[PDB]
Ligand binder design. Structure first.
Ligand SMILES: [Mg+2]
Ligand SMILES: [Zn+2]
Ligand SMILES: [Zn+2]
Ligand SMILES: [Zn+2]
Lengths: 47, 113, 49, 263, 45, 66, 137
RNA sequence: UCGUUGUUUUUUUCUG
């Protein structure tokens, strides 16, 4: 996966419409940190 | 850092049902209700109503831990009626009461203004 | 570290053997250890920091 | 059976009398009004450029708290469950503000009024920041000096006060019953006597005082509550009342549906 | 290609990492990197 | 630093009332009177208008970076 | 036992909410008239012993611009020291503390007493009162 | 391409 460290948004879920940047992309489950609070959250690659 | 999300308090996750019912073996005609994403706002209201009915022997509940938004309700009606029927009766009665109150308040406000 | 695990628990200074016992874990949110108010006595501990 | 008697009414507040209902009912109504009456408030601020003396988070927070006219919010879907990728115009409203001070002197005062609706699921009467009056500039957001500029592009969504206090439409809900303590739910701390040290409630006139020789009644129950309501202006007091009632009703309906569907 | 700013004159300019670190217009010796172009978000909470 | 938006305690909006409070102050009316005329009865709010210290004007006095 | 319950809505309205500023300081070190230390973004091929974090937020000039977000284990400054004899460069970065997060606020760049490049980074963030905090009358 | 390492030495003001 050469698609790391690029800003990514979320479309479905509880954090819909929030900006973020990929941090870890092991596979099928991306952990993107949220810019608004000081937290990180996981989310599958489809959302 | 370890703070729980504020949106988890009311948005029930799919995997867990809103309401879970269990029987209480120690005595007959008694069940234990495991609610979710609720607090005193609803539990107290339901309890006050159910206590007024004559055919209900024991109605109780408790908010186990405030950091978790759910409560459990213990209800046992005499053999005449299954507890679930009493529960739904209480729900319907409260809904009717609220509708009546809304009608009356609308009238009062209209005449007031 | 999952529920019901037994974990030691100490307060410094540990004067007497009651100053450190083994509890049962119960994972909860937020960032503070939590105790039953009774068991402070042996720890001679208060929640003032 | 339940009865209401509004005493003094107004757009923002209501002082009413509600009797012949379980104390649990009135208290649950108060809680639901304070907590579970959805409204609209800012939920995403993008500072395209700032030069004020105030931290970006500071301004974002201040914006979050400003009351919005959320009259028709009932008709807006929750952004969480709205199907549209990103935010459609039917699960959100977009407000934009950009005020700049110019000239070497003076100090501009960015007011809540400067916020201007850009989109929104029209013609729904939602989004416009609330104003006391015609000329009321509104809240004070910041002050700007020479060569200082601010450019933000806010977003609003429908949320319940449970999630955050910014969605609370009710300011403070008074509440009381038995001003004469005839039910004896309380014992009055006193140095000399209970009467000559304790001020009487403002509703003392509305109920007859207990007679001197009267005996305690034990089957009496609370029957009259004297609750006042106030709002931020984001919703009319009467609308808040009806909406809390509706929310409680539909929540109970959901509970009943779950119960019957368990089988 | 990197934007900058002075602390007294407050006039923007840029450096190629080779020019001595001074203000181009008033010769001042203090500079700050200007705000990035990326977008910023806040929950406003 | 700047007048708060809402009364932490209850929630009644107070932020917009700062200017009017000052204005009433300049013309000699005592603080209690000014608070009354603004219709601030619950002291949970009154504590704020009465005991806010304004600092942003102090910050402005510094020539901005830009 | 000296523990206190605080209204949550008071927090939500910003009771006792506070700012927080942290400053990181670094500068070029002159290891020789012809041998000095430079601020720049290193490349894995050209350097050795790079930090486990990520450098992506670094600019081309070796610094991070204000207004960007950072976090723990995030390299906010890229400094490379020449290796005493290619691939003759070793890291001298200044990673952010693993346990702190915030928003880069203001980068200060100038020359030290000796004319070497002199940098400073000030991150800021807001501390929300919560359980476990301390208060006193 | 797994792998993948980050100082000491004092002094100081603090916390229970
Ligand atoms: Mg102690
Ligand atoms: Zn939508
Ligand atoms: Zn200059
Ligand atoms: Zn108040």
């Amino acid at each position: 996966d050469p698609t790391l460290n690029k800003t990514v948004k979320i479309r479905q879920g509880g954090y819909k419409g929030k900006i973020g940047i990929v941090k870890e992309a092991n596979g099928d489950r991306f952990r993107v940190e949220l810019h608004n609070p000081n937290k990180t959250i996981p989310i599958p690659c489809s959302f | 850092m370890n703070a729980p999300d504020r949106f988890e308090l009311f948005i029930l996750p799919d995997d867990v049902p809103k309401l879970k019912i269990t029987p209480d073996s120690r005595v007959p005609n008694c069940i234990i209700i495991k609610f979710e994403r609720e607090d005193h706002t609803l539990a107290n209201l339901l309890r006050e109503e159910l206590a007024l009915y004559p055919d209900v022997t024991f109605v109780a509940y408790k908010v186990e831990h405030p950091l978790f938004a759910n409560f459990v309700m213990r209800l046992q009606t005499e053999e005449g009626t299954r507890p679930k029927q009493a529960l739904e009766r209480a729900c319907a009665s409260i809904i009717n009461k609220l509708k009546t109150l809304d009608h009356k308040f609308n009238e009062e406000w209209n005449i007031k203004n | 570290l999952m529920d019901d695990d037994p974990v030691l628990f100490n307060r410094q200074p540990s004067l007497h053997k009651m100053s450190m016992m083994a509890h049962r874990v119960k994972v909860m949110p937020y960032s503070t250890f939590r105790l039953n108010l009774s068991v402070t006595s042996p720890y001679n501990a208060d929640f003032d920091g | 059976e339940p009865k209401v008697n509004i005493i003094n009414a107004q757009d923002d507040e209501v002082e009413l009398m509600l009797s012949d209902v379980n104390l649990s009912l009135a208290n649950s109504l108060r809680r639901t009004m304070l907590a579970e009456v959805p409204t609209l408030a800012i939920d995403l601020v993008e500072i395209k450029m700032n030069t004020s003396v105030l931290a970006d988070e500071f301004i974002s927070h201040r914006l979050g708290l400003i009351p919005l006219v959320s009259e028709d919010v009932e008709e807006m879907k929750y952004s969480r469950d709205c199907t549209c990728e990103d935010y459609c115009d039917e699960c959100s409203v977009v407000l934009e503000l950009s005020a700049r001070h110019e000239g070497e002197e003076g100090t501009t005062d960015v007011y809540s009024s400067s916020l201007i609706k850009v989109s929104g699921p029209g013609n729904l009467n939602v989004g416009e920041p609330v104003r006391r009056d015609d000329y009321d500039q509104g809240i004070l957001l910041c002050k700007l000096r020479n060569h200082q500029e601010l450019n933000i592009r806010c977003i609003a969504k429908k949320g319940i006060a449970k999630e955050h206090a910014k969605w609370s439409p009710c300011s403070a809900i008074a509440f009381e019953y038995d001003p004469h303590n005839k039910l004896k739910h309380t014992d009055f701390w006193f140095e000399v006597d209970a009467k000559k040290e304790w001020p009487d409630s403002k509703y003392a006139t509305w109920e007859e005082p207990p007679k001197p020789g009267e005996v305690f009644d034990y089957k009496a129950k609370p029957n009259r509550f004297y609750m006042t309501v106030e709002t931020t202006g984001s919703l009319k007091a009467n609308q808040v009342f009806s909406r809390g009632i509706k929310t409680l009703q539909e929540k109970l309906a959901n509970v009943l549906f779950e119960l019957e569907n368990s089988r | 290609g990197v934007k900058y700013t002075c602390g007294a004159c407050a006039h923007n300019f840029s450096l190629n990492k080779s020019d001595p670190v001074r203000c181009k217009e008033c010769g001042h010796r203090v500079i700050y990197k200007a705000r990035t172009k990326r977008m910023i978000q806040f929950d406003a909470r | 630093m700047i007048i708060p938006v809402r009364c932490f305690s209850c929630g009644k909006v107070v932020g917009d009332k700062w200017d009017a409070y000052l204005r009433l102050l300049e013309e000699g009316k005592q603080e209690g009177d000014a608070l009354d005329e603004l219709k601030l009865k619950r002291y949970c709010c009154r504590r704020m208008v009465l005991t806010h210290v304004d600092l942003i004007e102090k910050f402005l006095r510094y020539n901005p970076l830009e | 036992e000296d523990s206190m319950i605080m209204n949550q809505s008071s927090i939500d309205r910003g009771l006792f909410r506070s700012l927080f500023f942290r400053s990181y300081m670094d500068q070029e070190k002159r290891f020789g008239i012809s041998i000095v230390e430079e601020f720049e973004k290193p490349t894995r091929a050209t350097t050795l012993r790079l930090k486990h974090g990520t450098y992506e937020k670094l600019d081309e000039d070796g610094l991070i611009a204000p207004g960007v977000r950072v976090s723990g284990d995030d390299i906010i400054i890229g400094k490379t020291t020449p290796i005493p004899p290619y691939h003759t460069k070793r890291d001298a970065s200044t990673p952010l503390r693993s346990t702190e997060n915030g928003i880069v606020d203001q980068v200060l760049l100038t020359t030290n007493q000796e004319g070497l490049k002199f940098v400073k980074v000030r991150m800021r963030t807001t501390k929300v009162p919560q359980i476990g905090d301390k208060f006193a009358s």
